[PDB]
C-alpha cells in the first residue's frame, strides 16, 4: 500500500550542496524511522542517518560533518542535504523506511532511487529520430521498429510508447557512453506485421534533469 | 426607514408588549416566527427584545431567515442559526419609490468574508478583487463596495 | 539480546515490573497506610480510635480490661472507655459539657 | 564507517540447494542477531527478505532459510529456480549505533541453453541525414552466452572509425542484448552502396547488410 | 451540470402558430424563471416573456398579443407558441434560464437555439455524394477527402464522421444558397495519407427538419 518516491535534481558541478526529498504516498509519517541509502554504480550499498519524526538524529560518522537530514511532518517530507560533494558521491539514492515497534529492523519499502551525477558539462537535450521498419525489417507476420535518442548529459532518461500503451515486444537497450561524453540509446518494438498499415505509434522520451519531453510518431517507410 | 447595509437597532426594554396587534393586523405580507409560534407570544416573558429595521427588494425577503445565502444574508445582515424571534415584512412601494429613481437606498455587494450573525459593517474601503493593490482609487479589480 | 554498553537508547536493557491488583471474592487484604496523630487529654475533642468515632473529653483510667478487649460499654450501651492501640492504656470518655 | 564481508558470484544447478555466506566481526554479527537479507534484481530496488537471521515475512517463498553459527550468518535457497539470478546483500546492527551492508553476491543458476544471436540493422533516419549526420545502428538480443563481438563493415570492408559498443547485459528472460553504433558523415552514408554488421558468437558468425535506399 | 435543450420543428409557411419546448436536463424546475430569446440572422438579440413556475406571466409588449408561454412542471417543459408568424420572425431561438434568489439577474445557461425558418417551399431531402482523394489529393504523408450534401430546404443540417469518431482535420464549410433556393454544402477531412488503404470512414448527414439520416462510406479511388 504505502509507497515512497524520490525527488530533487542532480547534475551540479563539484563542491556544492545537493538536496532530495522522499514524499510519502500511503501516509505513515510520525511513527517509524526513515533513512537514506546510497549506492555507487556497480558496487555495494551504504548507509546514512535517519530521523525519527518528533526528535531526530544523523549517523554514519564516515559521512558525518557533511550531511543533514530534516523532516517536515505536515506535508510528509524528508530533506537530505549533503554539502561540498566530491564526484565520488555519484550514485543512486534510495529512501527506505525502517522498522521498529514489531522489531523486524533491517529496512522495508524502498523508493526506486535517483541517479545523481556530479560533474561539469551541464545538461544537454536529446535529439530524437525514428527507426522505420521495412520489407527486410519484417519477419513474415512480424516486424520491428524503433526510436533513437542521442547526445544527452542527463544519463537517466526514460522512454514510453504511446503513453505507455504497449508492453508487448518493447525493449530498451542500455545507453552507450560515446567518446564525446554524451549518451545515446535506442528503443524498439516488435509486433505482428499486419497492423503496420492501419495503426499508429508514438515513442515518448522524458528527460527529467532537463525539461525535455518529446513524443514522436513512427511511420512505415515509403 | 434605514438602509440595508447599516440597519437600525432599537432595544425594546421593560414594557407591556402586545404582539396581537401585530399578529392580526393583516397589513403584513410576511410574518414568520421561528423560535416560537406567534399566538403564544402574548403569554411569555423574556429579558430583552431587539428590533432591527431596514429596506430591501421584494424578492430578497427570503434571505432574512436562519441559514440562507445571497448578497443580503452573506454580507449585509446575517441571522444566527438558532434564531428565536420573528420576521415581519410589508410592501412599501408608495413611500420609498419615486419617479426618476430613488437612489438613496444602498446595499453592500462586496466583502472579504461573510458576516458573523448580527454583525454590522459600515466601512467604505475600496474593495480589491484581483491581486493588484488598489491604493484607494477605482479601476479594474478595484471596486467601490456599495450599490444603490 | 546481545546487550552492549555502547548501544543507542532503545537498544539498552530496561527492567520492567507489572503490578496487577486483583479482587477475587475474599473478605479483605492489603491496603494503603493510615497516618495518625497525638492523643490529647482533658479537652473536648473529636476522636477516632481505629474505627471508633466519637466526641468528648479523654481521661486517664484506672479500670483493667482483659488483654483482648478494645473498648468498654455502659448499661444502656454507650462507649465509655477505650484502649489506645499504640501504648495500650485505658482511657475514659466523658461527654463535654451541655446544659 | 568500514564494511562487512561476502563472497563474489556463486554457481549452482536448478532443483538443487545452495548456501551463501556473510561473515563479520564478533562485534556486529557475533554480538547481535538482528541480521536481515535483501534481494535485488538488476536495475531495480532491493526487496526485503527476512529479519532476525530467519523469519520470511508473509509474502516470500518458503524455499529460503537463514541461519547463524557465530559472527557468520548464511542464507540457503532450495530448488534453485531460474528467476533467482540476482544480487543478495546482508545487513546488521553494528555497534556505535549504526548499520552496515555486505558486498553483494551474484547468483548464477548455470543456464542451460546456448541461444543464438537475434541480430538487426538500422540505416540512417532521414531527419538525421538532413541534419548533416548518419549513424548505423546494430542491435542484438536473445543470445544466451554473452560473449559476442561485433565487426563494422563498409559494403563489406572492416571499418574501425566511429564504432562504439556496449557490453552485453541481462534481459528479463535471462538472455542478453547489446548494441553497436557507427557514426558517419552523410557523404559517407551516400558514399557506400551497402554496409554490413558481423556478429561472432561461439564460432557462429551472423551478418546483416543494408544499402542506402 | 444543468443544461437546456430545444425541440420543435420549423418550416411552416407564413401566418400560422409555431411551438417549441426547452426540456430541462439537470433538473431545476420550480425555482427559477425561464425565458425565451430570439435572434434574427446577423442582428442583435431580443427578448420575450418568462414564466416563474407556480404563477406565470408574459412580456415584451412589442410581441404582446401574439405570444403565449406555458409550463409543465411534471416533465419539465416550457411551451412557447407564437401565432400568425410573418417570415420576419425567421431566427434562432434560445431558451436561457434567468436568475433570482442570489440577485445576479441577466440570464444564464442557454440552449443552442433552433433555426426556425418561415416560408413556402416545403422541406426537401438532401442528396449525398462522396469526394474521394487521389494521388493529386494527397500531400505526401497527408491526404484529404470529403462529402458533398446537396439541395435541401432544411437549412440547419448537421454532419458527423464515423458516428463522431474523428475530430482531427475535420472541417465543415458554410452552406451556399443556390439560385434555385436550395442549399448545399461540403465536409472534408485531412489525415495521414498512409491509413488510406487500410482504414474506413463514413460521413453521417442528419437532417432534423425532414427525417433524412444518411450515412455514406468514403473509399479510395480506383
Ligand atoms: C565504530 O567501531 C569501529 C570498531 O568496530 C571503529 O573502527 C576502527 O577499528 C579498526 C580496528 O577494528 C581500526 O583499524 C580503525 O583504525 C578504527 N577506526 C576508527 C575511526 O576508530 C570505528 O572508528 C567506530 N566508529 C565510531 C563512530 O565509533
Numbering used by the authors:
A (entry chain H), E (entry chain J): 1 to 222
B (entry chain C): 347 to 494
C (entry chain A): 495 to 593
D (entry chain L): 1 to 213
Extract from the study:
RBD, which directly binds to ACE2 receptor, is a major target for development of the therapeutic nAbs against COVID-19. The prefusion structure of S protein exhibits more dynamic conformational changes in S1 region, especially in RBD, which has two distinctive conformations, “up” and “down”.10,11 Only the “up” conformation of RBD can bind to the ACE2 receptor. To further explore the interactions between nAbs and S proteins, we solved cryo-electron microscopy (cryo-EM) structures of the S protein in complex with ten nAbs, in full-length IgG-form or in both IgG-form and Fab-form. Bivalent binding was revealed for the full-length form nAbs, which showed that the full-length form exhibits different binding mode and induces more RBDs to the “up” conformation than the Fab-form that is monovalent.
In pattern 1 that includes P2B-1A10, P5A-3A1, P5A-2G9, P2B-1A1 and P5A-2G7, two “up” RBDs are bound with nAb. P2B-1A1, however, exhibited almost no shedding ability, similar to the non-neutralizing antibody CR3022, suggesting variable capacity of these nAbs in inducing the shedding of the S1 subunit. The first group, including P2B-1A10, P5A-3A1, P5A-1B8, P5A-2G9, P5A-1B6, P2B-1A1 and P5A-2G7, has the largest overlap between the epitope and the ACE2-binding site on the RBD. Their epitope residues are distributed across the receptor binding motif (RBM), mainly in the cradle region. The heavy chain of P5A-2G7 plays the leading role like subgroup 1, whereas the light chain of P2B-1A1 plays the leading role.
